[PDB]
Design a protein around this motif. Structure first.
Motif, PDB file in Angstrom:
ATOM      1  N   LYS A 105       0.840  -1.188   0.000  1.00  0.00           N
ATOM      2  CA  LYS A 105       0.000   0.000   0.000  1.00  0.00           C
ATOM      3  C   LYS A 105       0.881   1.245   0.000  1.00  0.00           C
ATOM      4  CE  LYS A 105      -4.205   1.646   2.299  1.00  0.00           C
ATOM      5  NZ  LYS A 105      -3.725   3.028   2.635  1.00  0.00           N
ATOM      6  N   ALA A 106       1.991   1.169   0.718  1.00  0.00           N
ATOM      7  CA  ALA A 106       2.921   2.279   0.779  1.00  0.00           C
ATOM      8  C   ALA A 106       3.529   2.520  -0.602  1.00  0.00           C
ATOM      9  CB  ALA A 106       4.020   1.965   1.773  1.00  0.00           C
ATOM     10  N   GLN A 137       3.479   5.783  -3.425  1.00  0.00           N
ATOM     11  CA  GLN A 137       4.668   6.489  -3.859  1.00  0.00           C
ATOM     12  C   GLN A 137       4.796   6.418  -5.373  1.00  0.00           C
ATOM     13  OE1 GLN A 137       7.205   8.182  -1.783  1.00  0.00           O
ATOM     14  NE2 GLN A 137       7.172   8.990  -3.896  1.00  0.00           N
ATOM     15  N   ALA A 138       4.407   5.270  -5.931  1.00  0.00           N
ATOM     16  CA  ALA A 138       4.457   5.042  -7.370  1.00  0.00           C
ATOM     17  C   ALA A 138       3.511   6.031  -8.030  1.00  0.00           C
ATOM     18  CB  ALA A 138       4.028   3.619  -7.688  1.00  0.00           C
ATOM     19  N   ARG A 139       2.298   6.081  -7.501  1.00  0.00           N
ATOM     20  CA  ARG A 139       1.277   6.976  -8.008  1.00  0.00           C
ATOM     21  C   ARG A 139       1.787   8.405  -8.096  1.00  0.00           C
ATOM     22  NH1 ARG A 139      -1.549  10.604  -6.770  1.00  0.00           N
ATOM     23  NH2 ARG A 139      -1.293  10.711  -4.491  1.00  0.00           N
ATOM     24  N   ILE A 140       2.394   8.874  -7.021  1.00  0.00           N
ATOM     25  CA  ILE A 140       2.902  10.234  -6.985  1.00  0.00           C
ATOM     26  C   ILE A 140       3.957  10.489  -8.060  1.00  0.00           C
ATOM     27  CG2 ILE A 140       3.980  11.978  -5.502  1.00  0.00           C
ATOM     28  CD1 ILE A 140       2.853  10.527  -3.124  1.00  0.00           C
ATOM     29  N   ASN A 141       4.912   9.576  -8.216  1.00  0.00           N
ATOM     30  CA  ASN A 141       5.945   9.787  -9.224  1.00  0.00           C
ATOM     31  C   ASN A 141       5.373   9.834 -10.637  1.00  0.00           C
ATOM     32  OD1 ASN A 141       8.261   9.971  -7.582  1.00  0.00           O
ATOM     33  ND2 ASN A 141       8.281   7.738  -7.364  1.00  0.00           N
TER      34      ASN A 141
END
Lengths: 52, 52
Positions: free
Chosen positions: B19-20, B24-28
């Protein structure tokens, strides 16, 4: 694209600075020989050997 | 009791890590579309297509 235009700039920048410096160095070295401007008649040397 | 508290722990543990990572992937990914902060006259793009 292997390198930014900025980098290549900074590079070619230093290159020019160098080329500049060398030319100036060359000239000063050449002058370690003070030649006569004209062909007239030289007299006393106001400057003494080993002087500054 | 079909499984030790330890196992469930390790499980929920990895779940959280995932989930973490996703977040973070989404943000990048989102940051891949460089948008304009404001409205107005933009100038020269001091960066060329293909440049890193």
């Amino acid at each position: 694209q292997a390198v930014s235009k900025q980098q290549y700039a900074d590079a070619n920048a230093a290159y020019l600075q160098s080329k500049a410096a060398v030319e100036q160095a060359r000239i000063n070295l050449r002058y370690t020989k003070v030649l006569s401007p004209i062909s007239g008649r030289i007299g006393r040397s106001a400057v003494t050997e080993g002087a500054l």
